[PDB]
Amino acid sequence: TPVWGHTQLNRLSFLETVPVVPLRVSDESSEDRPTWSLPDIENVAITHKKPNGLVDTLAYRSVRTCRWLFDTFSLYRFGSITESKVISRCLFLETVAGVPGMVGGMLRHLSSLRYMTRDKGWINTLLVEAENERMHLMTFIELRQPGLPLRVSIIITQAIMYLFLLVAYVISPRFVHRFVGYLEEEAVITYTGVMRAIDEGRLRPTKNDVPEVARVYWNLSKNATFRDLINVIRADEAEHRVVNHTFADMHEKRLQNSVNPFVVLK
Amino acid sequence: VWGHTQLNRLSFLETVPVVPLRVSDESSEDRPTWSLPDIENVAITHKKPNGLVDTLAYRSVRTCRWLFDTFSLYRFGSITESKVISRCLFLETVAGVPGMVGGMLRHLSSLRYMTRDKGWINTLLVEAENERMHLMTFIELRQPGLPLRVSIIITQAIMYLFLLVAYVISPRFVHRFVGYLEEEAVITYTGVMRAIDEGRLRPTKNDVPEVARVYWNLSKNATFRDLINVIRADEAEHRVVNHTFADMHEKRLQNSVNPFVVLKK
Ligand SMILES: C/C(=C\Cc1c(O)c(Cl)c(C)c(C=O)c1O)CC/C=C(\C)[C@H](C)O
Ligand SMILES: C/C(=C\Cc1c(O)c(Cl)c(C)c(C=O)c1O)CC/C=C(\C)[C@H](C)O
Ligand SMILES: [Fe+3]
Ligand SMILES: [Fe+3]
Ligand SMILES: [Fe+3]
Ligand SMILES: [Fe+3]
Ligand SMILES: [O-]
Ligand SMILES: [O-]
Structure with missing residues (x-):
């Protein structure tokens, strides 16, 4: 369908359409x-x-x-x-789960670019993770909108963690891949805890108007609860857990420059 | 079947020797x-x-x-x-950088500030993947010398750092710079197409590489000319896209919706 061809390619700008484009949530990602x-x-x-x-x-x-x-x-x-x-926790931590996959993707991209070699599917895996974790932030910010102290400390967290992740990956991308491995091992724990706690009625959920951002992204029918939203967020983290543990392993064996095994499931 | 049982396995390292190399996964x-x-x-x-x-x-x-x-x-x-190939190989290394730093900085900004990004990240990210496909293509038609392989390494460093600070100081200027760059690229990529039509240039690579034929949806018949012609259109998409994004900055529109994500849907 897309009407993107050469009359549009010879335009100077589309600045003028900008005011009449809807803000449909599905575009976020x-x-x-x-x-x-x-x-x-x-x-x-x-x-x-x-x-x-x-x-x-x-x-x-x-x-x-x-x-x-x-x-x-x-x-x-x-x-x-x-x-x-719970949500205050997930909110703050999700800001720093978004960083890793953007440093790996971004550096493996640059490496592909300077020795002019083929990445074999690694870059597009990490950036969808980065994105998929950014969408974890976007969902929780529909649920709790924090205040000035928590926001200032989110900014310093990123400064610090950008610097560590970045310089850790340059020197041992196995280290950083191992590190998210284990990071997600804790992410999985924390979330099955929250589901268990709902199932034993110790935390009976009040936010069941699941946000539109989350409904589109996980293709959830209207009648989905906080527990159903949480599970899927926990399922995502089990994947990343295996991906960064598979990626770390691969480095351990000197398979960095080999096919990204998760390309097959697609 | 991508479900719990696969998510509950620890590592898929044993699968590496059984997964084959396919051109379709390079992007x-x-x-x-x-x-x-x-x-x-x-x-x-x-x-x-x-x-x-x-x-x-x-x-x-x-x-x-x-x-x-x-x-x-x-x-x-x-x-x-x-x-021609020498040149475009060199330059298409540099070209993948800008979208990535842009894409990254904006990702980073939605996380710290907790704000919708509204379609920019991807467009800026596939923009970097596109230029790299140009590059993976040109590596098929020539394998450059040691002199040039070093010249290419060091030039990443200057350029990477340049755009890093540039995009933090002023994203308006970067997008414009990129917009302008991709004028010049279309000039070059038409000089070439015109050189072919004249017979001042007789390509011998009118076997187009596998990577390129499934990246761009071409035929085994298509030639050098046709390859230069799909690339050029990539360079003109980034020309408009980027000059628009930089007009959006000049107007304090850098947190409205990326317009192109409707211009698809
Ligand atoms: C291992 C930790 C928490 C488990 C956990 C969770 O409980 C949750 Cl709920 C998430 C989302 C993640 C995501 O990784 C997560 O890692 C502490 C991590 C602390 C830092 C990185 C400091 C503050 O910079
Ligand atoms: C020669 C140049 C521009 C024309 C040109 C082309 O001729 C081509 Cl063929 C392309 C692809 C592009 C893509 O953007 C391109 O910009 C200068 C580029 C900058 C440097 C060399 C150093 C790093 O500052
Ligand atoms: Fe995570
Ligand atoms: Fe997450
Ligand atoms: Fe290019
Ligand atoms: Fe370009
Ligand atoms: O996460
Ligand atoms: O380019």
Whole structure:
């Protein structure tokens, strides 16, 4: 269908159409949407992959070290579970889950560009992750819109974590791939916790008007609940878990410059 | 069957030796869909410098071109096919950079500020994947020397850092610079097409590479000329797209909706 041809290609600008384009939520993201079956991802589960040497271990300790600081500073520990404290958590953390796949994608892109070699499907995997995690932010910001302290600390988090991820990937992209491996091992835990807690009525959900952004992106029928939204977000993290653990492994074996195994499922 | 059982496995390393190399996976699934006789009337345009920033973006490129052409010897002697491919190989390394840094910075901005991005990221990201496909194509038709492989490495560094600070200081200027660059590219890519029609240039690569034939949806009959003709249209999509995006900045419209994402749907 698209009416994009040479009369449009010889234009100077389309600045003028800008005021008459609708803001339909589906545009927020590309069409590489994830498609999960609620009854199948329902049985997603908590795994843990053994660290192989020093770098796998450094990686695993840092994620533990961070889970522990975060969990304590943020008071997630004592008090009952709450809607408020779940989404506030997911909101802040989702800002930093978006970074990794954009540094890997972006650097593997640049490498492809300077030794003029073929990437074999790695770049388009990482950037859909980055995107897919950015859409995790976009959903929770429909649910809780935070205030000035939490926002200022999100900005300093990105400054710090952009710098670490960036310079970690240049020196050991296995490290960073291992690190998201384990990062997501914790993401999966935290979310099955939230579903379990709904199922045992300890956190019975108030936000069931699932946002339009999330309905389009996960193709969810109108009658979907917070628990159904959460699960799918948890299913996404199990994928990333396997992808960054498969990617780390591949490096360990010196298979960086080999086909991205997840291209086949497509 | 991509479900829990696959998501609950730890690693898919054992699958690497059983997955085959396919040209269709070297990019995403967002491919140019051109029809040759339509895109034969792409054309050289020039946007008016609207103000001090544009004038600076334009005068940078014009000097980059003058310098590069006297230093590369483009104009010295006759057009040859080695001289065209040499050049476009060099330059198409540089060209993949801008969309990526742009795409990245905007991604980053939606995360820290928690704001809709409204279609820019992807367009700016497939824009980088496109230029890299041009590049993967040109690596098939020539494999450059050691001298040039070094010249290409160091030039990434200067250019990467340049756009990094440029896009943080002023995205208006970058998009314009990019818009202007892609005027010049269409000029070159028409000089070439015209050189073929005249017989001043007789390509020998009128076997077009596999990567390119499924990236662009061409036939095994299509030639060098036809390849230069789908690429040129890519360079004119980035010409408009980018001059529009930079008009959106000049007007404080850089957080409205990217208009092209309707111009598809
Ligand atoms: C391992 C951690 C939390 C588990 C966890 C979650 O519980 C959730 Cl809910 C998500 C989304 C993720 C996403 O990765 C996630 O990693 C602590 C990470 C702390 C930092 C990175 C510091 C503050 O910079
Ligand atoms: C020669 C130049 C421009 C013409 C031109 C072309 O002739 C071509 Cl063939 C293309 C593809 C493009 C793509 O954008 C292109 O811009 C100068 C480019 C900049 C440098 C060399 C240094 C890094 O600053
Ligand atoms: Fe994650
Ligand atoms: Fe996430
Ligand atoms: Fe190009
Ligand atoms: Fe270009
Ligand atoms: O996440
Ligand atoms: O280019």
